[PDB]
A paper describes a structure:
[name] (LV), a picornavirus originally isolated from voles, has been proposed as a zoonotic virus, potentially associated with type-1 diabetes mellitus, myocarditis and Guillain–Barré syndrome in humans. LV belongs to the Parechovirus genus and is closely related to human parechoviruses (HPeV) (∼48% amino-acid identity between the [name] proteins). The capsid proteins ([name], [name] and [name]) adopt the expected eight-stranded anti-parallel β-barrel configuration and are arranged with pseudo T=3 symmetry (where T is the triangulation number), such that [name] surrounds the five-fold axes and [name] and [name] alternate about the two- and three-fold axes. Structural comparisons place the virus close to HAV within the evolutionary hierarchy of picornaviruses, while substantial differences on both the inner and outer capsid surfaces, including the visualization of 12% of the RNA genome forming icosahedrally ordered interactions with the capsid, suggest the use of a charge-driven mechanism for genome encapsidation.
Here we report the determination of an atomic model of LV from a 3.78-Å resolution cryo-EM analysis. The LV capsid proteins are mostly well ordered, apart from residues 1–30 of [name], 1–36 of [name] and 1–3 of [name]. There are very marked (∼20 Å high) protrusions displaced some 45 Å from the icosahedral five-fold axes, but otherwise the external surface is broadly similar to that of other picornaviruses; being relatively smooth it is most similar to HAV21, although less angular. LV [name] most closely resembles that of HAV, which likewise does not have a pocket factor (root mean squared deviation for 83% of Cαs is 2.0 Å); similar characteristics between the two viruses in [name] are: a lengthened βH strand and alternative conformation of the GH loop blocking the entrance to the pocket, while the βC, βE, βF and βH strands shift so that it can no longer accommodate a lipidic pocket factor. LV uses the VP2 N-terminal domain swap across the icosahedral two-fold axis, first observed in a picornavirus for HAV21 (and seen in the insect picorna-like viruses), possibly imparting extra stability at this interface. The external surface of the LV capsid possesses unusual protrusions surrounding the five-fold axes, which extend the radius of the LV particle to ∼170 Å. Although these are poorly ordered and best seen in lower-resolution reconstructions, it is unambiguous that they are formed from the C terminus of [name]. Residues including Arg 6, Lys 7, Lys 9, Lys 12, Lys 14, Arg 49, Arg 62, Lys 64 of [name] and Arg 225 of [name] are engaged in interactions with the ordered RNA; of these, most of the [name] residues are conserved across the genus, while residue 225 of [name] is strictly conserved. Throughout the capsid the ordered RNA comprises some 900 bases, 12% of the viral genome. For other genera of the family, only occasional isolated bases have been observed.
Residue numbers in the entry:
A (entry chain B), E (entry chain B): 37 to 258
B (entry chain C), J (entry chain C), K (entry chain C): 4 to 49
C (entry chain A): 31 to 242
D (entry chain C): 50 to 244
F (entry chain A): 76 to 242
G (entry chain C): 50 to 147
H (entry chain C): 197 to 244
I (entry chain A): 150 to 223
The structure:
């Protein structure tokens, strides 16, 4: 009949006049199941939000000139805009993100077409103003050029880059990848005009902090 | 059982199995079969 | 880090494969199936024995044919490979060779002995060899009783083919019986089980026949 | 008797008949017509990104090879490897992904892919895409012919881009190869005939 | 320009005609932030659903006789009936639960009252029928008696016990804790009549498997 | 007082117990369902929900007119989702001679690793479902069937069950 | 088959089922009412020293747990341990003997 | 019969103003250490 | 060894008490172990409780009549 | 099989075969046969 | 008995138990089963 | 092809052969004479005059009404 404390993750329990616990006869608390009824690895559940997901496809046609914008992605708000995405449910609690980013631009061009899209990365405080930047210089950014011919995929890794130490989930704070027309495509006839572009993203180095009520926004850095 | 020793105990054993040729037919003539036999003596003593 | 993985060499392992180069069909058996970051491939044996192994599966017998016999005349009874049962699992293979058990089950209201004899060649070897079945391997079965007698493989064709119905080389045999002891309504039921079968060469999975 | 294997195609006798299950079989491929749910389907450019080319349940009883193999045994374990195959010119290029919810029916919204196994992959010099699905149950084994094994959905990431020298639309084929570790259990009769 | 494969958790990506990846100049991908803007441990996020939560309080008065039921908890459906609970968001994806259980029954009795409630545990296939069981024998169950006087808290640990190997989240499959009146309470005057009982639960040995669409149910064992 | 112990789980359920009696005049396949024991020493097993172990079946054949009768057991019921009862020959049939009896035991094959004693639900609850048919053109072939466990494993207890007067 | 105990609450199989008999059971406790011979009874101050609060036979067939356990076996040996339990405030005091 | 157990008062319950008037008690029969059971036998009862 | 009445009627069904089934037109040697609450049986007395060397139960099955038995004790 | 080891496996073995003299006739008098016998005890304990 | 040695004599032994597969069905063809058999010779001499 | 040889004298005559069938309704001693085999594989023995060896006799009893029958050879 003494003081018993109990602590799990955030919550904690300080009890007075405790009673010794009970357990069923011959208990076995080993978590894993052997033999296995599931082939998956038991670390799946926490790992799951890291899964790579289709993101914001766009359609790039003839008519669009240079400097035009094919598609747009707001980076940090991109992985859970809806309830459908895997990282949503667990991001609907914790209010901050230290996470790094992995985005793989998928593209398919029918052989015999020529032109280029550029996949760049613009952080938020940069993204605030397009009007300042010369177009010819966008290659200063972390980026990858994509040739129509002989490029299936463009793999670019983005480390966390932002002013404040931690960034708010529900906002745009990480900025986002914007895909621009480096040169117009050239189509011989007959060919399908629209060349579909799908930005197939991912996420790595998962982090969350600073609990909040499920639906409510909270200010942190400002 | 996560822990089970590997022995003949996989197969739970059985009673041993045999086959009968003659279905209990008595044989008179042969002396060998005739000599052995059930005694109505107590503890079959001689 | 922990979550991500990358190429470009091992994309074979992540499941990209060219079907145009299969090597041998048996070379695909060696192929390691693709796996993502989390899957645990572990072979878990719940039973000590394996029901998948060829030896075990055909140990379970299966019922082919039922007929009453009221007449002492020699009964021609032909054995096809199994249909509509777990024996039909054997339908994947053409060529088959191995000895096979026959479990016959005698039912006699009036006491009757019944005889069993098996001939791989049919009724006609070019002569009628069915004149008397005593010499061909007859094994006599008591009334209201059953026996496990197995037939050795005697054939002029080293490999029986399962599919075909052609009486010469196709079937797995032809079975002879006759009652004795002046009786009627002696009813038999006969079961066929393989022993240590050897199946050679596969075939595609057969169509179910609604029209027969 | 001394049996004679050498007359046969294979010198060595088949010890385990599981090795037949490992052989691929076209899903529901009994149809001559190209479309659209039958496992032999037509990838067309008439459809925008994110729309189903192929959506259906897969029962273990639909696939031809395992169909009789299912009637023989009641239970089975072990992972799938199910592989999609596109046939196209070296010119033709496009990307499509395969979403699979094990144990599901009438699925998705068509919007929700994620929280389900999928392989995004591209047409090219190589074609067959294999992906493995471990069996999922509370039980230590599952019924063979029985409840749905779950949807696989095939949708467009990027529409087929056809050239003047290149075909307009390509025909594709699904095949379910049985896994590495897959056991079958407790043999049982069924009402079917010839299988 | 070769074959590049990419695999994260469940998803995987097989690319042809790949391009070597890019990264910003002098990248540092180390996840943690030193110095730290957050005192929390970075393993918080996956651990979070294990947090102990208030569960289904009940009110035990004079009038209720013996064998009566104070409060009821359906074990596995208890930790995420609403969106508010911490384990909800991450259980709204994965369809199976191997998890073990930790439940601490909280109770407060004004000194000078006497009586007992019993905290038992009934698995589902047991719970199907109350009518079979003699009341006097419920102590066979894994349980803890609670005396009015001199018991602050009752700590009982429940290992996973159920027919099927894995159990469905959205259902009652684990059964549940039911709290019964072992003897009536006895109140002198004046005193507050109602003695409030709150079952303060928790969860341990977290597990999830078998992905499903976010809102849809799926059969597994039956 | 005795060398052996009647209290030990192994020994006590060695003694079999009688569940069901029926005459069979028809060759049609007989559906016969096995509940866990009531109203006998087998009811001592009513303390436990989860049970796993192989169990003996002692069937006893009585035939005025000579008849063979067949026994086959299926843990899954009549319906596995298909009708698997078409012919019982392949599922483990063991043939029993007339006026005779046998001890054949059934191995544990189930998609549910642990049977629960209490429930009557045909899927996972029962300890099995038993199939039989007569052969040899007969009638009034009467059987009696006995169920005895072998090296049972009982998991988790329950309170002592109420006697049901009202059923 | 290889049986799977870990799915169950207890990892180790129950060797002797005697251990169930060791579990306490309320004597004749089928009653909701508090009084007076039913094994669930009321200790009251309305009664002077040396008067029965509880008096009854105990058949082995009255106690719920052993009631079926009695129908299964004809004979038994071994000692009892029978335990009385009073629930009172830390204030309340009194002495009763069995 | 296995024999009576009698429960009588040595000293009456002394109740306070903050304390209950009368308390409810419970008897429990726990089976002993060494207790064997013997020679299993059927009975006429149902469900037990 | 105990009679019909152990204080309850235990004769409801004899299957659980050590039944051993005997085929038709046949005989068996089955021996009974000593189970008694009286360590020593007395030969002389006829009193059903402790005196006899036992009480024997049987029933026919298989819808028959004129099934005749004869029983020997050694 | 071109390659087969020469062993008792030519002859595929069998169940062992025996002959019964008395077809299950009970013997009263003899003490020896009388002593041994089936027990209705559980695990035949004394 | 206060003094009893602990041996196999707890369990009072028994007659050994076997199972018959074929219920005495004669086999003609097989030479092995045919060779062995009952002799009507006296003491089975050759 | 086979381990055993069907050609060897020992093996070939192991297979028995059927000589004669008769019903017997009368307790009177039945004279039944055994010729060497004709019209069967036993006729393979017709190549030799002089023969010496012990010979098996498999008799098969069929009785509608229960009857014991005796066999003796001279």
């Amino acid at each position: 009949d003494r003081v018993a404390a109990s602590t799990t993750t955030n919550a904690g329990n300080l009890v007075q006049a405790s009673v010794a616990p009970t357990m069923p006869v011959k208990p076995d608390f080993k978590n894993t199941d052997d033999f296995l009824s599931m082939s998956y690895r038991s670390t799946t559940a926490p790992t799951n939000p890291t899964k790579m997901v289709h993101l914001a496809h766009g359609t790039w046609t003839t008519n669009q000139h240079r400097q035009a914008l094919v598609a747009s992605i707001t980076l940090l708000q991109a992985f859970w805009p809806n309830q459908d995405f895997p990282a949503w449910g667990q991001s609907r609690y914790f209010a901050a993100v230290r996470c790094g980013f992995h985005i793989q631009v998928q593209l398919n061009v029918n052989i015999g077409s020529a032109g280029c899209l550029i996949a760049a990365y613009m952080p938020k405080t940069a993204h605030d103003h397009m009007n300042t930047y010369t177009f010819g210089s966008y290659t200063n950014l972390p980026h990858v050029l994509m040739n129509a011919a002989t490029t299936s995929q463009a793999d670019l890794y983005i480390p966390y880059v932002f002013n404040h130490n931690y960034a708010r989930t529900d906002s745009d704070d990480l900025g986002g990848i914007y895909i621009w027309v480096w040169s117009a495509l050239t189509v011989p006839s007959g060919s399908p005009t629209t060349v579909d572009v799908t930005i197939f993203g991912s996420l790595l180095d998962l982090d969350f902090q600073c609990p909040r009520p499920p639906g409510a926004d909270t200010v942190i850095y400002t | 059982t996560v822990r089970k020793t590997k022995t003949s105990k996989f197969k739970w054993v059985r009673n041993k199995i045999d086959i009968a040729e003659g279905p209990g037919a008595m044989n008179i003539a042969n002396v060998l079969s005739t000599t052995g036999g059930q005694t109505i003596a107590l503890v079959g003593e001689r | 880090n922990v979550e991500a993985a990358q190429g470009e060499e091992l994309a074979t392992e992540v499941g990209l494969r060219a079907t145009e180069n299969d090597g041998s069909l048996s070379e695909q058996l060696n192929m390691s199936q693709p796996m993502f970051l989390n899957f645990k491939k572990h072979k878990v044996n719940i039973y000590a024995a394996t029901h998948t192994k060829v030896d075990h599966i055909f140990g379970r017998a299966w019922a082919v044919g039922v007929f009453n016999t009221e007449t002492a005349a020699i009964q021609k009874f032909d054995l096809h490979f199994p249909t509509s049962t777990h024996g039909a699992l054997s339908r994947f293979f053409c060529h088959w060779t191995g000895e096979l058990n026959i479990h016959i089950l005698n039912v006699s209201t009036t006491n009757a002995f019944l005889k069993v004899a098996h001939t791989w060649f049919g009724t006609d070897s070019g002569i009628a060899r069915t004149a008397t079945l005593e010499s061909n391997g007859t094994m006599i079965i008591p009334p209201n009783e059953q026996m496990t007698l197995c037939v050795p493989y005697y054939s002029e064709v080293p490999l029986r083919c399962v599919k075909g119905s052609d009486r010469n080389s196709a079937g797995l045999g032809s079975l002879f019986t006759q009652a004795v002891g002046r009786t009627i309504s002696n009813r038999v039921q006969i079961f066929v089980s393989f022993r240590c079968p050897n199946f050679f060469f596969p075939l595609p999975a057969p169509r179910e026949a609604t029209s027969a | 008797a001394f049996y004679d294997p050498r007359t046969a195609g294979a010198a060595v006798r088949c010890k385990d008949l599981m090795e037949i299950a490992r052989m691929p079989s076209v899903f529901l491929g009994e149809s001559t017509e190209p479309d659209g749910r039958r496992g032999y389907f037509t990838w067309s450019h008439t459809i925008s990104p994110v729309n189903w080319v192929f959506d259906d349940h897969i029962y273990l009883e639909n696939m031809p090879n395992l169909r009789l193999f299912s009637s023989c045994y009641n239970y089975w374990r072990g992972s799938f490897v199910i592989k999609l195959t596109v046939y196209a010119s070296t010119f033709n290029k496009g990307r499509l992904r395969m979403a699979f919810f094990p144990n599901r029916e009438g699925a998705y919204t068509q919007d929700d892919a994620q929280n389900a196994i999928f392989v995004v992959c591209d047409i090219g010099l190589n074609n067959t895409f294999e992906m493995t699905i471990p069996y999922t149950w509370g039980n230590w084994m599952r019924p063979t012919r029985g409840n749905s094994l779950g949807h696989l959905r095939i949708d467009v990431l990027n529409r087929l881009t056809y050239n003047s020298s290149s075909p307009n639309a390509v025909n594709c084929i699904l095949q379910i190869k049985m896994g590495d570790d897959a056991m079958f259990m407790v043999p049982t009769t069924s009402n079917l005939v010839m299988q």
